[PDB]
Structure formats: C-alpha cells, structure tokens
Amino acid sequence: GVNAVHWFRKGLRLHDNPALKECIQGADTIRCVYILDPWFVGINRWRFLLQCLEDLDANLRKLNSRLFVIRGQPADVFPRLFKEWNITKLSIEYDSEPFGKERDAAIKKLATEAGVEVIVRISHTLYDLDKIIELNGGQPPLTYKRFQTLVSKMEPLEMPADTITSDVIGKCMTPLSDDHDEKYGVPSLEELGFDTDGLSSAVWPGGETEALTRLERHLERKAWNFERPRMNANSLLASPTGLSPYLRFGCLSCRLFYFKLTDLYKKVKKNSSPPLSLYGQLLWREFFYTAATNNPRFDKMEGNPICVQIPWDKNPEALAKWAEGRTGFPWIDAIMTQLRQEGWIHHLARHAVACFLTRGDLWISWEEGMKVFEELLLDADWSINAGSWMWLSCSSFCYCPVGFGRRTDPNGDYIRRYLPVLRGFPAKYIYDPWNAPEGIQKVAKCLIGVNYPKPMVNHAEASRLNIERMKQIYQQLSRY
Ligand SMILES: COc1ccc(/C=N/NC(=O)CSc2nc3ccccc3n2C)c(OC)c1OC
C-alpha cells in the first residue's frame, strides 16, 4: 500500500500542520518520525525538545499512533527507512534557514532516487519568504519599516490547516510493534547522557498542549491593550502567558496565533484594519527569517555582506565571565543566571547583556554572544539569534549595568532571586555591592572579591571608550 512518513523537525504540533495533513491524504500507513542526533546545546533546550516529543507522542496516541524517535542523521537514516518501511511519501514543514535548506535538498535527492514523493509545506512562517523577497526585487528588506510595507501589500493569509483528527486520519493506520518504546521511544535526559541531579521542574514545559493552554491565557491578558506592553520588574519573571519558546519549536503555529490575535482585536477594537503593531512579535520574527534565508553567512561577521566589519576584541576570559554570570555586575549576572537556569529572559534584559558584551562594555564580538544564547535560550533559533545580535551590536539593520536594574527593580528582589550570595545586601548597595562599606559587606556575609567577584570593568571608562569607538566607526561607516 501507500506508506507515508511525516518528518518532524520544527512544526512539533498536530494543529495547523498542512504538510502532515497532505501526507496522510491518500495514504495507507503513516509514521511520524523525529530524527534525534544527541552527539552531533544546553540542557534546558534538550529538556524542552524531549518534552515536545513526549507531548507529540501522547497526542499521537489519541489517533492510534505513536511518535517514532530515530537516532542518527537524516542522510544516513532515511535510505534505510525508505527500504525497511517501503516509503513512497515523505512530508516536511519547509525550513527557510540556509543549512536547513541545504539538508532538505540533500534529502529530497535521496527521496527522488528511491521513488519517494516529497511534500513540503510552509507553516513555520506566516509568509512565503521567497515571495516577499521577490516583491522587494530579489533582495530581503534590510529594515523593519520596509519589511512592514512589503508585508502590508501581500495577499491575506489563508486559514490554518485543520487539526489532525480521526476523521482526517481515516483509513490511514500506523503499524506498531509491542516493543515500540524500547526501539522508538522518547529518551530521557539521562539516556542522552546528562546528569539531572541539579534540575528542578521546568519553568517552560515543552509541547503543543502547553502552547495551546498558554495561547488562551495570552489572549485573555491582551483582552483585559493591543499596544506594546511596558516592562516592569514583574515582566522579568517567566510568564505563564509567554509563547516565544513554543513559536520557536513550532508547538504553536504562528498562523493560528495570527488569526486568534486578529479575531480578538476585531472583537475588542471593532475594526478589520488593525495596525501592524498588533503583529510586531510575529513580524520581527518573519523579518529575520526573510533576511537570513538566502545568506549562509548570516551568523558571521566576515563574509557577511550586510554586517559592518567592526574590529571586536578577542578576550576569552571576559567572554566566559559574561557567559557564566561572573561579571561582578549583579544586574548582568542575575540576567545571565536566569537565562542559564531557565532558558528565557525578557527582551530588554537581552538588550542589557548584549550591549554589555558588545558595544557597551566588553567590545567582544556579537558572534560570541550569539553562540552563548544559542546554547541557553529556548526561543532564539539560528536566524532570529544572529539577526538580533547584529541589530543590538550596531552591526546591521548604551545600557548602564547598574542603573538599568536599579530603575527596573529598585528593591533588588530580582537580584536576590537569582544571586543568593547577595541577599544580605540592602537595596542601597544591591546593584553596586563594591560600593558597600566593609561593615555592610561583612554583615551581608559577602566580601566583594571573595564571595562575589568585583565588577570586571569600570563601566564609565569602558562605555566612554566604546561609545567613541562606535561614533567614529559610523562617522566613517563606508570604511567598515
Ligand atoms: C541579543 O539578543 C536579542 C536581542 C533582542 C531581542 C528582541 N528584542 N525585542 C525588542 O526590543 C522589542 S521588538 C522585537 N520583537 C522581536 C521578535 C523576534 C526577534 C526580534 C524582535 N524584536 C526586536 C531578542 O529576542 C529575539 C534577542 O534574542 C536573540
């Protein structure tokens, strides 16, 4: 009969999954596979992924199916699967990222050689990015405002695809052996080799089920403005309404999010012509995917045509201090600790630690900060992470590491939550503990230089030098 495989990579969901819906159409058997290579990334990313697969597996059970988790690399695994399962249809959600496109072109050639039809559908982005690039003339818009103009002229988005249900599955069945778990089951972090003794309950549980619950809560919060919210101290904490990791893994469809937001706006504001500001989260995301898709050096400075060639410092010791939250600036270190422990920090917290590392204090390449966020951050994939780091560092498209935190959370509770060694300090000194008298340091049981490091730069001197560097660079921008 007709034996189909849907290959999950992103799009880790059953709702709005047109590739999977089309693949099941006219198929006698369906197997959903995730190809896992744990030896080819921080532990919170692995955990989030595994939880996404457990959720997918549980939701597939409802359809008399299971997720097949296969170890290895797609180029080695799919030829054997095509033969051992007699596959003639393989579906994927389209991946616009350069190395994804290259991988998928290689797989499509194997599938062509084996007599397998490849179904590719766009549903990780709102638009066909290639059509945006055609509308701008063959080059991506390199400013957000130009991106918004292009997008506002595009044909309206079609409805998200129907969720896979039993009436959709129909006659299509999944052949299952009794030892499915032993051979195809979702592994634990331990079975990938990680110690989990230090881990607590995940602040960001993976999965489509979690995503659809959060989407509902997110919309209620927006219904009880549609303008960009203002950050306060509470905004720094992970929110039960946060959607960004779910959008990054495809647990939540960006198109379903778009339609629900539009429906809420129309119900609350009573106009069918909402401002594109309603969609800023999704359109910035779409902007960077568009910028990145045809630029295989998007995550690099040298050889990247859109990146200013800035002579960054090379300083592995300062880089590691920043990455490990040992800068001696409690605001910076608390943010980097939350990122390390939980996998998410507020975007203005991102601005602060990125400015500190790059154009503000340490003059280290944005490429280095990007790699750290890649390991630790749940919601930033290759295109978004690179684009955001170039944007922040003034490389394409000055935060005070004391006063920003002090203005955001003057009582210092954010610091005390993530930097316990500093809990004894009073508010007057919690953001600048080097300024506390030796008496206050001793009472706080935290000698600066012993129990918590001294600040790694003088901010005023470092920012003054770096602000002059960036002014001179842009005063001669064509040189760079
Ligand atoms: C240093 O790294 C980062 C720096 C900044 C941001 C985002 N800051 N967001 C704003 O300033 C308000 S608008 C907005 N919504 C977006 C959604 C996606 C991508 C960009 C976005 N922008 C600009 C970030 O998150 C992606 C980073 O992580 C990699």
Residue numbers in the entry: 2 to 41, 47 to 230, 233 to 405, 412 to 494
Paper excerpt:
In this study, we revealed the effects of a new circadian clock modulator TH401, which contains a methylbenzimidazole moiety, on CRY isoforms by taking a target-based approach. TH401 directly interacted with CRY1 and CRY2, albeit with a slight preference to CRY2, and the X-ray crystal structure of a CRY1-TH401 complex revealed the binding mode of TH401. The overall protein fold was highly similar to previously published CRY1 structures. With regard to the binding mode of TH401, the 1-methylbenzimidazole moiety formed hydrophobic interactions with W292, R293 and W399, as well as additional offset π-stacking with W292. The trimethoxyphenyl moiety formed multiple hydrophobic interactions with residues R358, A362, F381, L385, A388, W397 and L400. Oxygen atoms in two methoxy groups ( ortho and meta) formed hydrogen bonds with the guanidinium group of R358, while methyl groups in two methoxy groups ( ortho and meta) formed C–H hydrogen bonds with N393 and S396. One notable difference in the binding mode of TH401, compared to almost all other CRY-interacting compounds, was the absence of a canonical H-bond between the linker (connecting the methylbenzimidazole and trimethoxyphenyl moieties) and S396. Instead, H359 interacted with the sulfanylacetohydrazide linker by forming two hydrogen bonds, one with the hydrazide carbonyl and the other with a hydrazide nitrogen. The binding of TH401 resulted in the repositioning of the gatekeeper W399 from an intrinsic “out” conformation in CRY1-PG4 (apo-like structure) to a “middle” conformation in CRY1-TH401. The W399 “middle” conformation resulted in the loss of an NH–aryl interaction between W399 and Q407 at the gatekeeper–lid loop interface in CRY1-PG4.
1 This clock is composed of a transcriptional regulatory network of clock genes, Period ( Per1 and Per2), Cryptochrome ( Cry1 and Cry2), Clock and Bmal1. In the core feedback loop of the mammalian circadian clock, transcription factors CLOCK and BMAL1 activate transcription of Per and Cry genes by forming a heterodimer. The translated PER and CRY proteins then repress the transcriptional activity of CLOCK-BMAL1 to close the loop, followed by the degradation of PER and CRY through the ubiquitin-proteasome pathway reactivating CLOCK-BMAL1. 31 CRY is a repressor of CLOCK-BMAL1, and CRY stabilization reduces the expression of CLOCK-BMAL1-target genes such as Per2.
